[PDB]
Design a protein around this ligand. Structure first.
Ligand code: NAG
Ligand code: F05
Ligand code: F05
Ligand code: F05
Ligand code: CA
Ligand code: CA
Ligand code: CA
Ligand code: CL
Ligand code: NA
Ligand code: NA
Ligand code: NA
Ligand code: NA
Length: 472
């Protein structure tokens, strides 16, 4: 195998690195996987389809302009170059290789499109028509947007967008399911907690966080239990950043944030789908859980779960490993159909006060078709009132002892509106047996005399009842 000759490929340290601090993408390229036959769409502010490093891979069938209702996602050019982001993301996935221009995409032989949908009023309908674009042609969608990262918002997809997720994973891609790759958020400076973002907190999105070049949690990172894995992005001014295509037919070395991590993940997922086109949306999440690598990512919260995998709320299961993903995909056996076990926990409302603990021993639908012995996602769907929402911290402990932070204190969240059946999600108990005692902890982290009531706690388990590996 001959590595790319593009002039900025040596600057693509997160691909071309020879020091083991990279996404192990050359190993997938050398196995023969470059994205041939896979179609990725960037849902953002448009795509410069004539960019010299994108035109060769551009796919109009992966593209649309939802803001102006036309097929052409070309960005709106302004003095401030406001609408450059989708072009930057597109080049991360699928910039052309070996053409003397800028660098390369992770999946540099994949086809790449863009939906122009952020440059206007972004309604539920706009989101839904974007997520649902051409779902039997587009394989993978990448989205680096969502509710405001102000550290005080709790919001998620409204009805049309949630319907789009369900239709995408159910009937999209020939019934295998659209793969929705999501950036987990950029609200770190505001102490944001990403389970308060219903797009990344969804089980239907494959949520990705960032690590800096030196292996640290960047300033902009949000921790939460819904994140699945990590790719490199930007950090401090001594650390390099992401190198990609830019607006006006240029090349940038300064693409940043979790917004740059999701496209890199989408590219790795494209290589993986080339290696096994029959993978379902759930298979892909299993592959990420099994192959991602904690090594040399620094965090104070690495914990071993019940099947011996290390997990962090900053990083999920760790860095994506493209070579390991494509290798494991090739002979992967499709997972069994998804089961859903609904357990309504409370028999009475519970005062929260300073601290509340709810313990319940469950059988996980023993004796029923939805019996789960192998967990995938778990949710604690909570309905509660509280006088100052951001003083709450919430944890969920699985029977195997895995402590998931469902909500960390958010100092800017002064809301008195509480949570209305909010489905806090954790990936940290993946492959555990969920039978046994679960513990929900709700704590007032402030010295104030705060008050409220938990009125509903539904534990929702997803998973199967067959096919476990020996614990790591
Ligand atoms: C895809 O997987 C399904 C489920 O295991 C199987 O029935 C089908 O034959 C597979 N198709 C291909 C082309 O491998
Ligand atoms: N998940 C996200 N919510 C807001 C946002 C901005 C940029 C990238 C990701 C997100
Ligand atoms: N769903 C959304 N809330 C705020 C926002 C900004 C941009 C795109 C989508 C959203
Ligand atoms: N998916 C949905 N979000 C809100 C809602 C109301 C009624 C039916 C479906 C939905
Ligand atoms: Ca247009
Ligand atoms: Ca190039
Ligand atoms: Ca956020
Ligand atoms: Cl469901
Ligand atoms: Na919403
Ligand atoms: Na998600
Ligand atoms: Na443990
Ligand atoms: Na058990």
């Amino acid at each position: 195998y001959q590595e790319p000759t593009d002039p900025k490929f040596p600057q693509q340290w997160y691909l071309s690195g020879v020091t083991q601090r990279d996404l192990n993408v050359k190993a997938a390229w050398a196995q023969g996987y470059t994205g041939h036959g896979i179609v990725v769409s960037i849902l953002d502010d448009g795509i410069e389809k004539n960019h010299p490093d994108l035109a060769g891979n551009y796919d109009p069938g992966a593209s649309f302009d939802v803001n102006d209702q036309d097929p052409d996602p070309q960005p709106r050019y302004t003095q401030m170059n406001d609408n450059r982001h989708g072009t930057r993301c597109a080049g991360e996935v699928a910039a052309v290789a070996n053409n003397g221009v800028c660098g390369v995409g992770v999946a540099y032989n994949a086809r790449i499109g863009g939906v122009r949908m952020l440059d206007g009023e972004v309604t539920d309908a706009v989101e839904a028509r974007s997520l649902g674009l051409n779902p039997n042609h587009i394989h993978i969608y990448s989205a680096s947007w969502g509710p405001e990262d102000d550290g005080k918002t709790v919001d998620g997809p409204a009805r049309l967008a949630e319907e789009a997720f369900f239709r995408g994973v159910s009937q999209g891609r020939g019934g295998l399911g659209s793969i929705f790759v999501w950036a987990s958020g950029n609200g770190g400076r505001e102490h944001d907690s990403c389970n308060c973002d219903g797009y990344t907190n969804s089980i239907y999105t494959l949520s990705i966080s960032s690590a800096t070049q030196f292996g640290n949690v960047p300033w902009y990172s949000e921790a939460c239990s819904s994140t699945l894995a990590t790719t490199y992005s930007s950090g401090n001014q001594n650390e390099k950043q992401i190198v990609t295509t830019d607006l006006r037919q240029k090349c940038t070395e300064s693409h940043t944030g979790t917004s740059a991590s999701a496209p890199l993940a989408a590219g790795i997922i494209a290589l993986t789908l080339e290696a096994n086109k029959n993978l379902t949306w759930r298979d892909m999440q299993h592959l990420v859980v099994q192959t991602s690598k904690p090594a040399h990512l620094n965090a104070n919260d690495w914990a071993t779960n019940g099947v011996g995998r290390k997990v962090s709320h900053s990083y999920g299961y760790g860095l994506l490993d493209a070579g390991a993903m494509v290798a494991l995909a090739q002979n992967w056996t499709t997972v069994a159909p998804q089961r859903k076990c609904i357990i309504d926990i409370l028999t009475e409302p519970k005062d929260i006060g300073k601290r509340l603990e709810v313990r319940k021993t469950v059988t996980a639908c023993l004796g029923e078709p939805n019996h789960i012995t192998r967990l995938e996602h778990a949710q604690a769907r909570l309905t509660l009132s509280y006088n100052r929402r951001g003083d709450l911290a919430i944890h969920l402990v699985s029977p195997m002892g895995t402590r998931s932070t469902l909500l960390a204190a958010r100092p800017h969240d002064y809301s008195a509106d509480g949570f209305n059946d909010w489905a806090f999600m954790t990936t940290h108990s993946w492959d555990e047996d969920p039978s046994g005692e679960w513990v929900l902890e709700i704590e007032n982290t402030s010295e104030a005399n705060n008050y409220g009531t938990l009125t509903k706690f539904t534990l929702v388990l997803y998973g199967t009842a067959s096919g476990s590996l020996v614990p790591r």
